[PDB]
Amino acid sequence: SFDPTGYTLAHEHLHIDLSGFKNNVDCRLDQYAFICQEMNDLMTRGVRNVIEMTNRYMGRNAQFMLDVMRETGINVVACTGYYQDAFFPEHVATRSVQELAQEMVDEIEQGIDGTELKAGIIAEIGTSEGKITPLEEKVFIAAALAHNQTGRPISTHTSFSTMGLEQLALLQAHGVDLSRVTVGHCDLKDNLDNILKMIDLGAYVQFDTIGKNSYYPDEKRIAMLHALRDRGLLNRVMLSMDITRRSHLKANGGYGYDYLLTTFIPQLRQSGFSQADVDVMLRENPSQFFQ
Ligand SMILES: [Zn+2]
Ligand SMILES: [Zn+2]
Structure with missing residues (x-):
């Protein structure tokens, strides 16, 4: 299963389909051969695990993930949960918070999509821009309930x-040990103040939008990583690319998942990070958090 001797990409999508919400086939990341080739490339750079963030209604495909693992030998940790307000199915409002929690618990305990594969994390549970809507709050409470029963991280x-701070306050108010929570996408703006506060509360933070330079530059992500390293906070930071589109794949003229290792990490080491510093984020942290 999980291989603690290798690297872990903390937030990725191997099979996601948000094409129906957008009317864009680019958002239907389901090109098997290409995805398998990308996993083989990751394997050559020491990656052994990928934490897949596609929950049921985001277009998850357990069989596809089982197949990718069978073909490449990479380990994929599947998830369970609900996305964000704009993408929620109608039933998030009509089901009770208890029913939502039960669903997440069964996906963790029995299996997902009719296969033998089980969800290993409650994820990606999101909130909207600048606000937590009533439905998102309900999903976060359900996540808290499912975590309090199974112990699987959020x-x-x-x-x-x-x-991010609001998400942590909500989860903690519902009994969640914040060391079992990892906050996604903390690297899309100058966000040091919030990040330091989140780490102070005991949560893990993620710089998982590496390569998405039209949103925020990698140079600035590197500067923030240095701030964390300077304060001895690297044991709370995890990394990823958050690949979501066909155009992100190398076969389609994109940068691929291994861009993290072929390009970003080399720039990080060039700016001053030791390989040990890198290994804390890519190997140590995930092994301690995801298991
Ligand atoms: Zn996300
Ligand atoms: Zn994602």
């Missing part, structure tokens, strides 16, 4: 690096 989605 991995979130912050919209443009907003509301």
Whole structure:
């Protein structure tokens, strides 16, 4: 299963389909051969695990993930949960918070999509830009309930690096040990103040939008990583690319998942990070958090 001797990409999508919400086939990331080739490339750079963030109604495909693992040998940790307000199915409003929690618990305990594969994390649970809507609050409470019963960690989605502290306060008010929560997308803006506060509360933070330079530059992500390294806070930071589109794949003229290792990490080491510093974020942290 999980291989603690190798690297872990903390937030990725291997099979996601948000094409129906957008009317864009680019958002239907389901090109098997290409995805398998990308996993083989990751394997050559020491990656052994990928935490998949596609929950049921985001277009998850357990069989596809089982197949990718069978073909490449990479380990994929599947998730369970609900996305964000704009993408919620109608039933998030009509079901009770208890029913939502039960669903997440069964996906963790029995299996997902009719297969033998089980969800290993409650994720990607998100909030909207600059606000937590009533339905998102309900989903976060359900996540808290499912975590309090199964102990599986919670991995979130912050919209443009907003509301992270609010997500933590909500989860903690519902009995969640914040060391079991990792805040996604903290790297889409100058977000040091919030990040330091989140780490102070005991949560893990993620710089998982590496390569998405039209949103925020990698140079600035590197500067923020240095601020964390300077304060001895690297043991709370995890990394990823958050690949979501066909155009992100190398076969389609994109940068691919391994861009993290072929390009970003080399720039990070060039700016001063030791390989040990890198290994804390890519190997140590995930092994301690995801298991
Ligand atoms: Zn996300
Ligand atoms: Zn994502």
